[PDB]
Amino acid sequence: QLLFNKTKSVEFTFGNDTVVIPCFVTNMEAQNTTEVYVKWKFKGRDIYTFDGALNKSTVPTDFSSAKIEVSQLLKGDASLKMDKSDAVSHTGNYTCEVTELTREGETIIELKYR
Amino acid sequence: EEEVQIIQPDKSVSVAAGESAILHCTITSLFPVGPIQWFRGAGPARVLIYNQRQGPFPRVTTISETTRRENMDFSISISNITPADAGTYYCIKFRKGSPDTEFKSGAGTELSVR
Ligand SMILES: *[C@@H]1O[C@H](CO)[C@@H](O)[C@H](O)[C@H]1NC(C)=O
Ligand SMILES: *[C@@H]1O[C@H](CO)[C@@H](O)[C@H](O)[C@H]1NC(C)=O
Ligand SMILES: *[C@@H]1O[C@H](CO)[C@@H](O)[C@H](O)[C@H]1NC(C)=O
Prior knowledge:
The complex is a heterodimer.
Chain A: E1 9-11, E2 18-21, E3 36-42, E4 45-51, E5 56-58, E6 67-68, E7 80-83, H1 84-88, E8 93-100, E9 103-112
Parallel strand pairs in A: 1-9
Antiparallel strand pairs in A: 2-7, 3-4, 3-8, 4-5, 6-7, 8-9
Chain B: E1 6-7, E2 12-15, E3 21-23, E4 26-27, E5 36-40, E6 47-50, E7 60-62, E8 76-78, E9 87-95, E10 101-105, E11 109-113
Parallel strand pairs in B: 2-11
Antiparallel strand pairs in B: 1-4, 3-8, 5-6, 5-9, 7-8, 9-10, 9-11
Residues 32, 34 of chain A line the site of one 2-acetamido-2-deoxy-beta-D-glucopyranose.
Keywords (chain A): Angiogenesis, Apoptosis, Cell adhesion, Cell membrane, Disulfide bond, Glycoprotein, Immunoglobulin domain, Inflammatory response, Membrane, Phosphoprotein, Pyrrolidone carboxylic acid, Signal, Transmembrane, Transmembrane helix
Organism (chain A): Homo sapiens (Human)
GO molecular function (chain A): cell-cell adhesion mediator activity; fibrinogen binding; protein binding involved in heterotypic cell-cell adhesion; thrombospondin receptor activity
């Protein structure tokens, strides 16, 4: 498995213009982003997929803003970034799935809108 | 760079109830990007026995150090075998996507209980 630096939950108020959900793999050894696949899951569906082999990101219509900092992937950072509009309409537990070659793992972070 | 082969050397394994069973699987390549999963049975009702992402899977222990990038041994040990554990176990390679698609399956290992 890929191993994670876990986080129970994060928060963001109305003042938070953009929302960041932390995901950090600790035993990542990817040589190129082509080796990497990232899934951010929410209520079953994939609200964001990064396909490194194809170098493409896929999002549904509701999640028009969701993206990650691809520059950070090789470091093991697959944190998710979205605006306030997408955040409020989708509040709950998030699953961060990362795959490197054949190794895979996931971890859960709950988004709270206090 | 050649197409991965999935090798389950044992066509069949037998074991007394309450005891453990080793299910061997090795692959020849770590490509393409996507995980290995163990299933019992084939078809739409097959049962997920193990993967790296959705654990821990009680009763299932990995034979090798599967947190290592270069690991190609996906053999597992299943403890406390019951008659319910009987059937054919498939070590299966998947490609990433929404959803992940099955890329190639091992021959299968027939377990039976004494
Ligand atoms: C990553 O892999 C692609 C495709 O194989 C290649 O074109 C690119 O040069 C690689 N990037 C680096 C930094 O090596
Ligand atoms: C990912 O896409 C960007 C923009 O389209 C491109 O500049 C970059 O080379 C791609 N990364 C690869 C091919 O590793
Ligand atoms: C998030 O998951 C936990 C279980 O670990 C659950 O108790 C909680 O209700 C979930 N949050 C939502 C918004 O469903």
